[PDB]
Design an enzyme around this catalytic site. Structure first.
Site, PDB file in Angstrom:
ATOM      1  N   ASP A 138       0.823  -1.227   0.000  1.00 29.97           N
ATOM      2  CA  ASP A 138       0.000   0.000   0.000  1.00 29.97           C
ATOM      3  C   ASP A 138       0.859   1.281   0.000  1.00 29.97           C
ATOM      4  O   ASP A 138       1.973   1.277   0.544  1.00 29.97           O
ATOM      5  CB  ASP A 138      -0.895  -0.015   1.257  1.00 29.97           C
ATOM      6  N   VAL A 139       0.307   2.356  -0.582  1.00 30.33           N
ATOM      7  CA  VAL A 139       1.027   3.642  -0.708  1.00 30.33           C
ATOM      8  C   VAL A 139       0.892   4.586   0.517  1.00 30.33           C
ATOM      9  O   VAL A 139       1.799   5.425   0.755  1.00 30.33           O
ATOM     10  CB  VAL A 139       0.648   4.331  -2.069  1.00 30.33           C
ATOM     11  N   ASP A 140      -0.233   4.382   1.242  1.00 26.31           N
ATOM     12  CA  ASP A 140      -0.560   5.289   2.314  1.00 26.31           C
ATOM     13  C   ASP A 140       0.173   4.855   3.584  1.00 26.31           C
ATOM     14  O   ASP A 140      -0.459   4.552   4.586  1.00 26.31           O
ATOM     15  CB  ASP A 140      -2.072   5.373   2.521  1.00 26.31           C
ATOM     16  N   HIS A 160      -1.568  -9.434   9.726  1.00 28.42           N
ATOM     17  CA  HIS A 160      -2.400  -8.253   9.882  1.00 28.42           C
ATOM     18  C   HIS A 160      -2.260  -7.784  11.375  1.00 28.42           C
ATOM     19  O   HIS A 160      -2.336  -8.588  12.306  1.00 28.42           O
ATOM     20  CB  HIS A 160      -3.795  -8.622   9.487  1.00 28.42           C
ATOM     21  N   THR A 172     -11.389 -12.303   9.973  1.00 32.35           N
ATOM     22  CA  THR A 172     -12.393 -11.851   9.029  1.00 32.35           C
ATOM     23  C   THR A 172     -12.224 -12.441   7.632  1.00 32.35           C
ATOM     24  O   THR A 172     -12.276 -11.722   6.654  1.00 32.35           O
ATOM     25  CB  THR A 172     -12.462 -10.326   8.957  1.00 32.35           C
ATOM     26  N   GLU A 230      -7.857  -8.985  -0.406  1.00 24.31           N
ATOM     27  CA  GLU A 230      -7.304  -9.519   0.831  1.00 24.31           C
ATOM     28  C   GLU A 230      -7.960 -10.836   1.172  1.00 24.31           C
ATOM     29  O   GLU A 230      -7.291 -11.725   1.692  1.00 24.31           O
ATOM     30  CB  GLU A 230      -7.509  -8.532   1.990  1.00 24.31           C
ATOM     31  N   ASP A 253       0.090   0.233  12.768  1.00 26.91           N
ATOM     32  CA  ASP A 253      -0.562   1.553  12.870  1.00 26.91           C
ATOM     33  C   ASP A 253      -0.459   2.011  14.289  1.00 26.91           C
ATOM     34  O   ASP A 253      -1.201   1.497  15.168  1.00 26.91           O
ATOM     35  CB  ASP A 253      -2.011   1.475  12.445  1.00 26.91           C
TER      36      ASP A 253
HETATM   37  O1  LIG Z   1      -8.641   5.709  -4.326  1.00 28.80           O
HETATM   38  C1  LIG Z   1      -7.766   4.873  -4.101  1.00 28.80           C
HETATM   39  C2  LIG Z   1      -7.966   3.833  -3.198  1.00 28.80           C
HETATM   40  C3  LIG Z   1      -6.942   2.916  -2.963  1.00 28.80           C
HETATM   41  N1  LIG Z   1      -5.707   3.046  -3.623  1.00 28.80           N
HETATM   42  C4  LIG Z   1      -4.583   2.114  -3.487  1.00 28.80           C
HETATM   43  O2  LIG Z   1      -5.081   0.887  -2.889  1.00 28.80           O
HETATM   44  C5  LIG Z   1      -4.472   0.778  -1.586  1.00 28.80           C
HETATM   45  C6  LIG Z   1      -5.572   0.093  -0.597  1.00 28.80           C
HETATM   46  O3  LIG Z   1      -6.511   1.096  -0.165  1.00 28.80           O
HETATM   47  P1  LIG Z   1      -6.507   1.649   1.298  1.00 28.80           P
HETATM   48  O4  LIG Z   1      -5.061   1.921   1.676  1.00 28.80           O
HETATM   49  O5  LIG Z   1      -7.454   2.769   1.381  1.00 28.80           O
HETATM   50  O6  LIG Z   1      -7.151   0.456   2.025  1.00 28.80           O
HETATM   51  P2  LIG Z   1      -6.843   0.350   3.553  1.00 28.80           P
HETATM   52  O7  LIG Z   1      -5.446   0.079   3.937  1.00 28.80           O
HETATM   53  O8  LIG Z   1      -7.402   1.700   4.247  1.00 28.80           O
HETATM   54  O9  LIG Z   1      -7.802  -0.750   4.057  1.00 28.80           O
HETATM   55  C7  LIG Z   1      -4.042   2.182  -1.298  1.00 28.80           C
HETATM   56  O10 LIG Z   1      -2.899   2.060  -0.516  1.00 28.80           O
HETATM   57  C8  LIG Z   1      -3.512   2.661  -2.587  1.00 28.80           C
HETATM   58  O11 LIG Z   1      -2.289   1.964  -2.747  1.00 28.80           O
HETATM   59  C9  LIG Z   1      -5.488   4.088  -4.485  1.00 28.80           C
HETATM   60  O12 LIG Z   1      -4.383   4.168  -5.046  1.00 28.80           O
HETATM   61  N2  LIG Z   1      -6.512   5.013  -4.743  1.00 28.80           N
HETATM   62  O1  LIG Z   2     -10.788  -7.145   9.056  1.00 33.27           O
HETATM   63  C1  LIG Z   2      -9.961  -6.835   7.931  1.00 33.27           C
HETATM   64  C2  LIG Z   2      -9.793  -5.307   7.667  1.00 33.27           C
HETATM   65  O2  LIG Z   2      -9.071  -4.770   8.744  1.00 33.27           O
HETATM   66  C3  LIG Z   2      -9.127  -3.352   8.751  1.00 33.27           C
HETATM   67  O3  LIG Z   2      -8.412  -3.018   9.904  1.00 33.27           O
HETATM   68  C4  LIG Z   2      -8.386  -2.828   7.531  1.00 33.27           C
HETATM   69  O4  LIG Z   2      -8.349  -1.408   7.501  1.00 33.27           O
HETATM   70  C5  LIG Z   2      -8.995  -3.383   6.265  1.00 33.27           C
HETATM   71  O5  LIG Z   2      -8.175  -3.003   5.192  1.00 33.27           O
HETATM   72  C6  LIG Z   2      -9.099  -4.914   6.377  1.00 33.27           C
HETATM   73  O6  LIG Z   2      -7.785  -5.461   6.462  1.00 33.27           O
HETATM   74 MN   LIG Z   3      -3.727   1.115   3.151  1.00 32.38          MN
END
Ligand SMILES: O=c1ccn([C@@H]2O[C@H](COP(=O)(O)OP(=O)(O)O)[C@@H](O)[C@H]2O)c(=O)[nH]1
Ligand SMILES: OC[C@H]1O[C@@H](O)[C@H](O)[C@@H](O)[C@H]1O
Ligand SMILES: [Mn+2]
Length: 272
Positions: A138-140, A160, A172, A230, A253
């Site tokens: 992931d990028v964020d 996870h 999950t 996932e 996190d």
């Molecule tokens: O509008 C978007 C939504 C998701 N992503 C990519 O898909 C990944 C997974 O989404 P996100 O990180 O929101 O999921 P999370 O970790 O919050 O469950 C992001 O890191 C980005 O790498 C993106 O590029 N643009």
């Molecule tokens: O229960 C699974 C989920 O857990 C959250 O914490 C996460 O943000 C989601 O991306 C998914 O992994």
């Molecule tokens: Mn993410």
């Protein structure tokens, strides 16, 4: 063929003293679970540098998520595979929004425009010709500490951070038998995060090909797995055991989960 390591001077491992007594360091199918204190990174760096290892790092940055790239890339330069060859592949709908990041020697970046993650990775011939391993994240996120060649192996998943203490019935996983990603309540080893997996290019293309075929079946059938790609990654790693598993040091996190004593390093973390 693998040439000889040179002479090295380091502390002797002692069989009657475990590195870590507080956590499981090996899965029941004899794959290392990578925690700080389990590996001598000097020995690992020598092994992988002797093979002139190149690591590809894939990241998707679509729509607003292009804003996460500057920190993601600048901290990867500080902490990801430093000393080894790295090729970053940034998939984006906005090539002109990718920030100009100064790279260390032996590291390159490619911008791949896209108009999906599993389908995009399974680019197949290009990766086979340019890198030895692929890491998919992931990028964020940002790197805060060492993420290095200790992770590399034919196939790895990452625990996870919400579920590493949980019993399997709480995971999950997709629970509908109508989904290709279905896992019953008495199965499962771990709950792996979609945010950090990887392997040799061949094993990563297998995984992403398999996940992409399963997701297409689910689509045809009118079903979408509860945690999308996932859920499919977890079903794949249940039936194709990873040869290393990364501890939650590798996907954390701190805002949500703090800094428990069991994590001696927070290496790769969510950006608020
Ligand atoms: O509008 C978007 C939504 C998701 N992503 C990519 O898909 C990944 C997974 O989404 P996100 O990180 O929101 O999921 P999370 O970790 O919050 O469950 C992001 O890191 C980005 O790498 C993106 O590029 N643009
Ligand atoms: O229960 C699974 C989920 O857990 C959250 O914490 C996460 O943000 C989601 O991306 C998914 O992994
Ligand atoms: Mn993410």
């Amino acid at each position: 063929f693998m040439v000889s390591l040179p002479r090295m001077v380091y502390p002797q491992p002692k069989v009657l003293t475990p590195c870590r007594k507080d956590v499981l360091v090996v899965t029941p199918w004899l794959a290392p679970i990578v925690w700080e204190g389990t590996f001598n990174i000097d020995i690992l760096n020598e092994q992988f540098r002797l093979q002139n290892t190149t690591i590809g790092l894939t990241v998707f940055a679509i729509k607003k998520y292009v804003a996460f790239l500057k920190l993601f890339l600048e901290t990867a330069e500080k902490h990801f595979m430093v000393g080894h060859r790295v090729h970053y592949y940034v998939f984006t709908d906005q090539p002109a929004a990718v920030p100009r990041v100064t790279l260390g020697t032996g590291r390159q970046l490619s911008v791949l425009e896209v108009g999906r993650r599993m389908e995009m990775i399974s680019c197949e011939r290009r990766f086979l010709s340019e890198v030895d391993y692929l890491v998919c994240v992931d990028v964020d996120m940002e790197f805060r500490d060492h993420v290095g060649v200790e992770i590399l192996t034919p196939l790895f998943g990452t625990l996870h951070p919400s579920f590493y203490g949980s019993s399997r019935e709480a995971f999950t996983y997709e629970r509908r038998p109508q989904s290709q990603a279905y896992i019953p309540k008495d199965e499962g080893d771990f709950y792996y995060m979609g945010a950090f997996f990887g392997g040799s290019v061949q094993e990563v293309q297998r995984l992403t090909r398999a996940c992409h075929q399963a997701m297409m079946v689910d689509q045809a059938n009118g079903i979408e797995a509860v945690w999308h790609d996932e859920s499919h990654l977890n079903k794949y790693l249940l039936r194709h055991k990873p040869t290393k598993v990364l501890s939650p040091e590798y996907l954390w996190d701190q805002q949500l989960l703090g800094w428990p004593a069991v994590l001696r390093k927070l290496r790769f973390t969510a950006v608020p």
